[PDB]
Ligand binder design. Structure first.
Ligand code: CAO
Length: 145
């Protein structure tokens, strides 16, 4: 897997295909892409973008740490999962975040992906909640100090 910077617009196709296929493409144009300091990473394999992840500064009222970042749009294409594409994006992002002085990385994780974030050292906080129309989510976080 090769991890490279990508632009926000480069994420829409895979966000749409993997995360939100039953909504218009506009549902994948996350407003948070337009928040200060947002950045995006792609994982490439055999000449194809196959994994994506997006990060921006956002301090969650319920997590402790002066500077926090949120992960959105975490997805790897079927056929290319279980290759450490996702893990590679997260580790690369952790370097960028640590260099920026961020204290923690959090996600409103799909409960179906909770084991993935667990393997990457995230913890669950609070209770499972629903996010229309994309189902059960749970707050998860990793302290990176
Ligand atoms: C969740 C994921 C992004 C994972 O991507 P990946 O590239 O396959 O991850 P990876 O780095 O190869 O996997 C890392 C580890 O977690 C495990 N893992 C991956 N997906 C998992 C899941 N859904 N549940 C539990 N464990 C998982 C892998 O088996 C691997 O474990 P080992 O090291 O023990 O073999 C991908 O399966 C996916 O896109 N799923 C559908 C969309 C989704 O749910 N995205 C997350 C939304 S959170 O807001």
């Amino acid at each position: 897997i090769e991890v490279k910077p990508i632009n926000a617009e480069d994420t829409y196709e895979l966000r749409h295909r993997i995360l939100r296929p039953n909504q218009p493409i506009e549902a994948c144009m996350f407003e948070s892409d337009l928040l200060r300091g947002a950045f995006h990473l792609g994982g490439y394999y055999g000449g194809k973008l196959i994994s994506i992840a997006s990060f921006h500064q956002a301090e969650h009222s319920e997590l402790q740490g002066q500077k926090q970042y949120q992960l959105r749009g975490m997805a790897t294409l079927e056929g290319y999962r279980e290759q450490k594409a996702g893990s590679s994006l997260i580790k690369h992002a952790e370097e960028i975040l640590r260099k920026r002085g961020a204290d923690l990385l959090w996600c409103n994780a799909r409960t179906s992906a909770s084991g993935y974030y667990k393997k990457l050292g995230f913890s669950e906080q609070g209770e499972v909640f629903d996010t229309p129309p994309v189902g059960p989510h749970i707050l998860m976080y990793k302290r990176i100090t």
